[PDB]
């Protein structure tokens, strides 16, 4: 039952500072424009120890499967090749991406009936709110 509160199909309902987060990460202009327009759904499922997070939008579809605490290689929507580790720390999914000596962290947390995603690069934080589909 690891992560039951996260499992299901979620749809983006609001975003703040995501363009600025992408700038901080190094995402180029045309990718930022199209990625920032997206209204993705996030589909989270668990099978045994394997968690799968799929993100579907008109921009890109991504899918990652992983075991908590076990590093994996990820190709992000913006085409960075990163080394990622996802852990569950005090009920929060914490997703760290490492590439080119840089690091960014994406946190996913349940708050009321929402799933709140906080993306942090250096001093820039973006908050994205998802609701059940
Ligand atoms: O998967 C997600 C979902 C979000 O709501 C926010 C960030 N990311 C990762 C992401 C990173 C870069 C780009 Cl361009 C798009 C999405």
């Amino acid at each position: 039952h690891m992560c039951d509160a996260f499992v299901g199909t979620w749809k983006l309902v609001s975003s703040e500072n995501f363009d600025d987060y992408m700038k901080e990460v190094g995402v180029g202009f045309a990718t930022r424009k199209v990625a920032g327009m997206a209204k993705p759904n996030m589909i989270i499922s668990v099978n045994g120890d394997v968690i799968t997070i799929k993100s579907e939008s008109t921009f890109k579809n991504t899918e990652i499967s992983f075991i908590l605490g076990q590093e994996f290689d990820e190709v992000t929507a913006d085409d960075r090749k990163v080394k990622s580790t996802i852990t569950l720390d005090g009920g929060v999914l914490v997703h760290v991406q490492k590439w080119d000596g840089k690091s960014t962290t994406i946190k996913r947390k349940r708050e009321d009936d929402k799933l709140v995603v906080e993306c942090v690069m250096k001093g820039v934080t973006s908050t994205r709110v998802y609701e059940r589909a």
Side-chain angles (χ1 to χ4, degrees):
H1 288 250
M2 59 147 204
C3 276
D4 286 1
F6 291 103
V7 165
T9 308
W10 301 90
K11 53 184 197 272
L12 181 74
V13 297
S14 69
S15 185
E16 44 202 274
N17 300 317
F18 190 53
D19 187 68
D20 280 345
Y21 168 78
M22 289 189 289
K23 283 184 174 182
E24 205 72 8
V25 168
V27 184
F29 181 89
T31 300
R32 288 200 316 279
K33 295 302 114 178
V34 176
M37 282 290 292
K39 295 281 192 154
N41 300 141
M42 188 186 301
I43 306 82
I44 304 176
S45 61
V46 181
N47 183 325
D49 298 330
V50 184
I51 301 170
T52 301
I53 303 174
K54 292 176 75 169
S55 315
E56 298 183 315
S57 75
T58 62
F59 169 56
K60 199 80 44 168
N61 296 322
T62 62
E63 180 175 338
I64 60 170
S65 294
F66 59 89
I67 295 176
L68 297 168
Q70 304 196 358
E71 187 165 63
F72 59 99
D73 287 309
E74 175 181 7
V75 176
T76 67
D78 63 306
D79 294 325
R80 283 171 290 129
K81 285 61 84 175
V82 307
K83 293 193 172 296
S84 294
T85 311
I86 300 176
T87 58
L88 187 61
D89 303 324
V92 178
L93 285 165
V94 181
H95 181 177
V96 184
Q97 300 176 335
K98 303 298 190 181
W99 78 105
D100 296 338
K102 301 170 188 165
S103 188
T104 189
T105 298
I106 302 165
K107 294 183 177 177
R108 295 171 175 89
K109 57 185 76 161
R110 278 293 309 274
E111 284 180 35
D112 303 317
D113 285 327
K114 301 166 166 29
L115 185 162
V116 179
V117 185
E118 290 167 359
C119 298
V120 173
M121 176 67 184
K122 292 151 90 191
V124 178
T125 306
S126 173
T127 301
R128 286 166 64 92
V129 174
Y130 293 71
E131 286 189 4
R132 300 271 193 183

